Paper text:
Here, we report the discovery and identification of a novel lipase from Lasiodiplodia theobromae fungus (LTL1), which hydrolyses C8–C10 ME efficiently. LTL1 can perform hydrolysis over pH ranges from 3.0 to 9.0 and maintain thermotolerance up to 70 °C. It has high selectivity for monoesters over triesters and displays higher activity over commercially available lipases for C8–C10 ME to achieve 96.17% hydrolysis within 31 h. To obtain a steady source of C8 and C10 fatty acids, hydrolysis of C8-C10 ME can be carried out enzymatically with lipases and esterases. Structural analysis by protein X-ray crystallography revealed LTL1’s well-conserved lipase core domain, together with a partially resolved N-terminal subdomain and an inserted loop, which may suggest its hydrolytic preference for monoesters.
To gain further insights into its selectivity for monoesters over triesters, we solved the 3D structure of LTL1 by protein X-ray crystallography. The crystal structure of LTL1 consists of two nearly identical polypeptide chains covering amino acid residues 83-449 (chain A) and 84-449 (chain B) of L. theobromae lipase B (UniprotKB: A0A5N5DNA6), respectively. The N-terminal portion of the expressed LTL1 (residues 19–82) could not be resolved in the structure, likely due to proteolysis during crystallisation. When compared with CALB, both LTL1 and AFLB have an extra N-terminal subdomain, albeit with a different size and conformation, and an inserted loop flanked by two cysteines that form a disulphide bond. The loop in AFLB flips inwards, covering the active site, whereas the loop in LTL1 bends outwards, leaving LTL1 in an “open state” that has similarly been observed in CALB. The presence of the additional N-terminal subdomain and inserted loop covering the active site seems to suggest that steric effects could be part of the reason for LTL1’s preference for slimmer monoesters over bulkier triesters.
Author numbering: 83 to 449
Amino acid sequence: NIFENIAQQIADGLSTLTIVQALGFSPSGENSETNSNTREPSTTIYPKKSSSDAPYSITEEELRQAIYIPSDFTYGDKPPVIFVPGTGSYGGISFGSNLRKLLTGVSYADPVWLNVPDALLRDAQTNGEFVAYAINYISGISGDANVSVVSWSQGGLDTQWAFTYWPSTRALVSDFVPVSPDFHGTVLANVICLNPGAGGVGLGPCAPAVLQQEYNSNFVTALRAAGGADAYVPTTSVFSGFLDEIVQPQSGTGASAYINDARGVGTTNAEVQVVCKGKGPAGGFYTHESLLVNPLTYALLVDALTHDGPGSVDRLDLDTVCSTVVAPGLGLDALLEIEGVNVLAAVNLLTYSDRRLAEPALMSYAA
Ligand SMILES: *[C@@H]1O[C@H](CO)[C@@H](O[C@@H]2O[C@H](CO)[C@@H](O)[C@H](O)[C@H]2NC(C)=O)[C@H](O)[C@H]1NC(C)=O
Ligand SMILES: [Ca+2]
């Protein structure tokens, strides 16, 4: 029986590989990207909720289908929480072994998650459309409750892009909790794609979302010049300065994950090695992916969800939070699962058929 659950886990993990999907399989289980969601929202959200919003380029059918609503969802009784995966991954598997498992069956959260086609590798401007639609749609079918957003890696960058160009979504998000975000992209993408940045032809073929996540990319530059480098809602950014093998730089105020707060809406910038320094293993070495099981990450998420404003380092009992390797309620097996999540993602990055020399054109709205 325990065998059947491992077989089904592996099958669900492999269905997220685009090479396997090319054989005609679809993402399965919690990574299903063809969900049937038949409730309508209280208000027109398509093609625009606000006449200030950027247009959608993707059909509402596809936008809505990437949202995975568990049967246990309470449509507003609890506060909804939308989970957003990172590059090469799906919302189901990015968080099922970590944060979303911990947020299943509690009173202050009600999880749903995004399964974007092609493992979040496609143009990030369209990944951003998925987050914008999800915020408006989930709220609009949940009694117009506020939602929260938790993201991993490019997910946070996608959320800032939805906030920047879909203003209507700012009004409905109590908390944005990005884990290992790259709000300034990453120079490791410039290196791997042998690419000058600024959308220039580079010698390394790379997925569109990878090219747009270069440190100086047109996507990142446009987003930051439009306001994407400052928080729009209370933002609890959690990142590791030792060592993020995907996102660099990633330490101090210069970290790609650092969100400024010029609008004064409230921000926490938590480098775990800083916050937990001298106080336990949770201040030790954490990867881009292993951060998702760090107790500081979980503690700051719950704090943010149970209090006005962002998660508060100073309100936490750092002596207790920092004292363990993994969040309470996970085992060291979560450390293993999250390593496999990263491997699957890596495979996707290396083997995705849509490799390009140049970064997607900015849509007319971003320019
Ligand atoms: C839902 O979240 C939004 C954004 O965090 C909240 O809207 C902000 O509310 C504060 C004070 O209530 C205002 O000063 C800001 O200008 C608002 N921001 C935006 C962009 O609207 C809103 O209060 C939350 N709603 C609920 C019911 O929690
Ligand atoms: Ca809060």
